[PDB]
Symmetry: D2
Subunit: 233 residues, 4 copies
Amino acid sequence: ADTIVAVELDSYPNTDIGDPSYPHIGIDIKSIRSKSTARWNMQTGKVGTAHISYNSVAKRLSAVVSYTGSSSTTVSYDVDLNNVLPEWVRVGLSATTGLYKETNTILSWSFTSKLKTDANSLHFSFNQFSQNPKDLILQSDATTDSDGNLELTKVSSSGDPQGSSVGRALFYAPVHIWEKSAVVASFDATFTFLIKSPDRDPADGITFFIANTDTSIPSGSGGRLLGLFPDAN
Amino acid sequence: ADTIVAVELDSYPNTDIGDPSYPHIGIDIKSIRSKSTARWNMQTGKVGTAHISYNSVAKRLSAVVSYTGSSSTTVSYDVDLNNVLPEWVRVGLSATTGLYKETNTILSWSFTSKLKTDANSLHFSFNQFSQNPKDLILQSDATTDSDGNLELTKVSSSGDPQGSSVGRALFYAPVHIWEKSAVVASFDATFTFLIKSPDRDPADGITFFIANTDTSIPSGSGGRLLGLFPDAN
Amino acid sequence: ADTIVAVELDSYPNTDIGDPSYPHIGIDIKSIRSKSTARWNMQTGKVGTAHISYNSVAKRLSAVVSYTGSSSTTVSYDVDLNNVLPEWVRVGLSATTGLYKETNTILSWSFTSKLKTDANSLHFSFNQFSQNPKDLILQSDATTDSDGNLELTKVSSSGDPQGSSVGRALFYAPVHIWEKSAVVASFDATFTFLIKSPDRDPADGITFFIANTDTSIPSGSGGRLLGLFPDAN
Amino acid sequence: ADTIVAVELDSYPNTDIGDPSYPHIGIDIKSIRSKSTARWNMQTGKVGTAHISYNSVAKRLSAVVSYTGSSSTTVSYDVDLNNVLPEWVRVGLSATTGLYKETNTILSWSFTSKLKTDANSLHFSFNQFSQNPKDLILQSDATTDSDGNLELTKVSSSGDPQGSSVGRALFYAPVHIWEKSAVVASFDATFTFLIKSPDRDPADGITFFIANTDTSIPSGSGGRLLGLFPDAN
Ligand SMILES: [Mn+2]
Ligand SMILES: [Mn+2]
Ligand SMILES: [Mn+2]
Ligand SMILES: [Mn+2]
Ligand SMILES: [Mn+2]
Ligand SMILES: [Mn+2]
Ligand SMILES: [Mn+2]
Ligand SMILES: [Mn+2]
Ligand SMILES: [Mn+2]
Ligand SMILES: [Mn+2]
Ligand SMILES: [Mn+2]
Ligand SMILES: [Mn+2]
């Protein structure tokens, strides 16, 4: 299986598998069962912004989600990512839909990682996406539309979101997030998203994640498993 | 008085005023009495590197000091800097010497701050310093030498450090580290230093600090007070 | 007098003083009489974007102005800026109005300069401006409005532009754009603007400029002189 | 065949194929026969630095090579790279040796490309290289040594350079250097190198190049052809 670290924007509460009884954002460390979660006042229909940051010294993975002119949602979890993730990784975005749906549009995405022992670094940012982006590995249904937006999950020609869909987008170049005796390593990511839906209770969510470089959509990882895990353990 | 936040590289143990009985690095929040300290295996004579980072979401000020081919020293303190510092600040470097001395040479210094509500930012970096640097506010004895290094404390023409000296260097432009309803704010700083000394027990240390924009060397802030505070409260 | 280098977005054709008989953008080197100009298809009422770049090796100052979904305007001039500008400078934005008016709103502004001999650098960017920005030197009428925009020239409470106005905004920290034996130096700047006007022929324009660090609005530098020069020589 | 743009640090004068009768750096546009060259006061044994920059507005490819405490070598060529290169490319470093040899060690390499229509970007930098770098495509003999240096051409266990060797290193992620109606696109690259040799006349050189994303070492592209072209046309 893969090794996964992620910040989930969980729109549908799957109380049966540990999820709180309300939309939320959480930090997942090798398990869909978030190590930490926080109430997310979902603004279906409005453009949101997610910011994720971490550094090997403070060892505190944090994330904040906001919408113009409205309070933000934040979540943090203390953990030394060097204990979880391998030295070389690929970073990406994933999203799913199940019985209930929603659009999982990504309008922009930037990422920066630095490894000091000087200081090697990788930084990329898309304010728009082109169809057939050669610097992205699109998995599942994920695709880029004519507007320059990244649709992680299927969206009809009418723009209507489809259920039971899954997709991911990984940056092409692997990233060296750590090495023995490195002095400090850090990474920061930001993405803007647009979740729309005709459903009274939209599902399932969007995530920013980091995994082994050969990561792929696990068998039956749809719906409540945000396309990151094979099961709910 | 000033409002000060700092990461101190305390070379001399002043046990009388809270200091541990060994060289150390610490985080000071409006008091020379560090809120958190860690043992610093001082490498007198070798070039060291300090890295300081913080973001408004994780709210954890961290710092790591290292030397080539040798373990590093780290220290962190959980605190919401928005509660301590004013919205506009100036960042700088300070250093002192008392009865016992040491050189407090700065070879390079970089700093980055971002404020998102987009994202305003300020970034500067010196790999060398020119004499009469117009983008630095030099306070006390602090000066730039012919080699392009910043000498925070007095150093004889022979290169010998002098005791009872104090100096600071602030970046010229004020920095807006926070604003109401900002989504996230962060800053990161790095500097390389060279502390040399003929003394068996060198003093007193070097700090990276953030304070009110009109900050200045407090009356009798020399020696064990690292040129940041008027007293030891 | 001051030493000035600038990229002018000249909205009003002052044919009497060398100006072409149409709105234009030009590169000015110590003279309002541009060394090079190009036809500017002014989009009064729409948000424009200006990008200015230069490096000591290619020695070619360039600038491009564009508006969404419409062709751009470009202008270049080969010149070694080390022959014109002093080693330390301040960069800024200026704008004016005369008999005829227009708003000269700046929505964002970023700047980056690098000097290698390593590589010292300065970078700042505002996606919004706060009233009473401590990292800007506002000259003349220039002010920040409640929306977070920079109004270089007077704008009535109703938003109506006023004639015979002048204003400039300089970044606070001086910039070291060059030093003897430097290997390469470069700078890049971008700003977005909004020029509105009830006039059939709006005036006078907006500029990005670089000058001596103590530069100020020259006596009677209003109107066609874009607040940069004392006369039209 | 491939589409190649490159800055060559040509250490051996192959006068028969257009080369000047002295070591030189040049800009090659789809031909080993440089469109522009300049005398290179080669400092065999000392660490050199190369800086390459270009932007779609000025349309002037430039490069400068220097060594500590000694004059630099510069070369420029006016050309709209959008006419030569395809929209998606891969950037890299290449080097060769023929009858005569030299080491072609790369100590660091950074690259930045921006495409505005906002502003997509890619930036990476290595201050050291790890063996088996997953974010580099190593071609030919190119390899990373235990010191963290990139050896483009074969170097014996004793550190002695070998003749008749060729190698290249490409960054893993493709780069989108241009798109229709883009406002401005730019790229900048820097690398430090170490060329050593026991030969009275070392060969053959090092280059930074940009080519089609599937570029590879052309058949018999060794020696004077710097591993970029199949012939000398
Ligand atoms: Mn970098
Ligand atoms: Mn951040
Ligand atoms: Mn319901
Ligand atoms: Mn910035
Ligand atoms: Mn950092
Ligand atoms: Mn002792
Ligand atoms: Mn920099
Ligand atoms: Mn640019
Ligand atoms: Mn008219
Ligand atoms: Mn970028
Ligand atoms: Mn450059
Ligand atoms: Mn010879």
